[PDB]
Amino acid sequence: MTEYKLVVVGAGGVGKSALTIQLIQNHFVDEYDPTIEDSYRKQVVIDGETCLLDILDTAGQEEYSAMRDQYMRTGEGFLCVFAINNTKSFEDIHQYREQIKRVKDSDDVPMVLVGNKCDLAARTVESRQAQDLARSYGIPYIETSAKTRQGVEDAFYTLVREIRQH
Amino acid sequence: MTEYKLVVVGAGGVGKSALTIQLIQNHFVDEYDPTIEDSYRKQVVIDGETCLLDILDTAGQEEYSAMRDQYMRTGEGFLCVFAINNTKSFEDIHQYREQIKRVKDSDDVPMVLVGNKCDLAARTVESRQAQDLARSYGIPYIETSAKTRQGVEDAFYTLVREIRQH
Ligand SMILES: C[C@H](OP(=O)(O)OP(=O)(O)OP(=O)(O)OC[C@H]1O[C@@H](n2cnc3c(=O)[nH]c(N)nc32)[C@H](O)[C@@H]1O)c1ccccc1[N+](=O)[O-]
Ligand SMILES: C[C@H](OP(=O)(O)OP(=O)(O)OP(=O)(O)OC[C@H]1O[C@@H](n2cnc3c(=O)[nH]c(N)nc32)[C@H](O)[C@@H]1O)c1ccccc1[N+](=O)[O-]
Ligand SMILES: [Mg+2]
Ligand SMILES: [Mg+2]
């Protein structure tokens, strides 16, 4: 069948594992799983279309220098995730973009912006801010929460749609 | 606040009222409401952003000749809806596109493609077909059902996102 190599990218502790765990095994990872390279692949029906979502949850901290180069060349879609209480995670959602452009030899590659953790009162990255970066980037902006599942499907499915025009 | 004039467009009996009724008043309209010009407007939080969704559900049958011209000039986003069991509704999702381009003096205007009624066994418009029209159009493709609510939010929210880059 059709199938999709989505890489889930972003900083440490922003949520990208709780995102994926939400998508597949249907629960919140309050508890612990301090991980690096993780691969799940699912038989999924997106808009009447049968497809394999093959998703590479990645490691935050840069124990990961040129190893980012590998999978990034083998990623069709990229979910660039950050958190709304960690302004710094936002600031770094640019050098991820820049390294992807590097390895891809391309300046527009399927990508979605995800300001995660939105069920929190501890807001620091306003939407308005985040949104105009998506704008600067030409990539969508979808806010999310792995606590509430809120946003999680919109998030992954949008990216797929991005790949479809590419 | 920010606010969004979404027009919901498409053929007769494809579902565009059951779509909207699903979005707002939270139920399926099995029963009856054979309608023309209908306006609902909602205070909605889309991705941390407060906005007024002002949505014009429209009439199917062309009792509607130049009256389409009016609201179409006052529509930011357009949901172009059809049904998966009515190949003809598909075929006509082009002359809606063409009249919008007409009145807009524009060839790319925020728009989403919605092949509705997907909870049905009576399929006639395959995804593959529909999808490559979205492609031909550069507009997304989202399948939906007002029976199951399935797709309904993805549908409207995507379009908003389309308007945001425009
Ligand atoms: C960097 C390292 O792990 P990492 O893999 O580099 O970074 P992750 O994004 O994978 O971290 P993970 O998503 O597993 O943890 C997210 C943290 O926020 C919480 N969580 C996740 N997303 C949300 C959200 O949407 N809302 C709410 N309310 N809670 C959420 C989790 O309980 C967890 O403490 C890591 C760092 C810090 C904490 C965890 C952690 N980890 O490996 O689990
Ligand atoms: C043209 C005229 O009305 P119209 O306003 O021109 O066209 P509408 O799209 O508004 O028609 P509406 O959406 O109200 O009705 C949809 C029909 O399919 C059913 N329905 C809607 N969408 C779905 C879907 O996702 N799945 C399923 N299983 N059922 C759905 C409804 O019960 C209804 O019979 C009209 C024509 C035929 C029938 C109704 C009708 N109408 O005014 O209600
Ligand atoms: Mg992880
Ligand atoms: Mg109607």
From Swiss-Prot, chains A, B:
Keywords: Acetylation, Cell membrane, Cytoplasm, Disease variant, Glycoprotein, Golgi apparatus, GTP-binding, Hydrolase, Isopeptide bond, Lipoprotein, Membrane, Methylation, Nucleotide-binding, Nucleus, Palmitate, Prenylation, Proto-oncogene, S-nitrosylation, Ubl conjugation
Sites where the protein binds GTP: 13-18, 29-35, 59-60, 116-119, 145-147
Activity control, per UniProt: Alternates between an inactive form bound to GDP and an active form bound to GTP. Activated by a guanine nucleotide-exchange factor (GEF) and inactivated by a GTPase-activating protein (GAP).
Effect of residue 17 to N: Dominant negative. Prevents PLCE1 EGF-induced recruitment to plasma membrane. No effect on subcellular location of isoform 2
Pfam families xref list: Ras
Effect listed in the UniProt record for changing residue 13 to R: In SFM; somatic mutation; shows constitutive activation of the MAPK and PI3K-AKT signaling pathways
Superkingdom in the source lineage: Eukaryota
Localization terms from the record: Cell membrane; Golgi apparatus; Golgi apparatus membrane
Matching InterPro entries: P-loop_NTPase, Small_GTP-bd, Small_GTPase, Small_GTPase_Ras-type
Tissue distribution of the protein: Widely expressed.
Substitution effect: residue 89 to C: Found in a patient with severe fetal hydrops and pleural effusion; uncertain significance; decreased activation of Ras protein signal transduction
Result for mutant: residue 83 to T: GTP-binding activity reduced by factor of 30
Membrane topology, record value: Lipid-anchor
Placement of sequence motif Effector region: 32-40
Alphabetical GO biological process terms: adipose tissue development; animal organ morphogenesis; cell surface receptor signaling pathway; cellular response to gamma radiation; cellular senescence; chemotaxis; defense response to protozoan; endocytosis
Residues found modified as N-acetylmethionine: 1
Modified residues (S-nitrosocysteine): 118
Main enzyme class: hydrolase
Similarity section: Belongs to the small GTPase superfamily. Ras family.
Reported disease: Costello syndrome: A rare condition characterized by prenatally increased growth, postnatal growth deficiency, intellectual disability, distinctive facial appearance, cardiovascular abnormalities (typically pulmonic stenosis, hypertrophic cardiomyopathy and/or atrial tachycardia), tumor predisposition, skin and musculoskeletal abnormalities.
Annotated function: Involved in the activation of Ras protein signal transduction. Ras proteins bind GDP/GTP and possess intrinsic GTPase activity.
Quaternary state and interactors: In its GTP-bound form interacts with PLCE1. Interacts with TBC1D10C. Interacts with RGL3. Interacts with HSPD1. Found in a complex with at least BRAF, HRAS, MAP2K1, MAPK3 and RGS14. Interacts (active GTP-bound form) with RGS14 (via RBD 1 domain). Forms a signaling complex with RASGRP1 and DGKZ. Interacts with RASSF5. Interacts with PDE6D. Interacts with IKZF3. Interacts with RACK1. Interacts with PIK3CG; the interaction is required for membrane recruitment and beta-gamma G protein dimer-dependent activation of the PI3K gamma complex PIK3CG:PIK3R6. Interacts with RAPGEF2.
UniProt-recorded name of the protein: GTPase HRas
Gene: HRAS
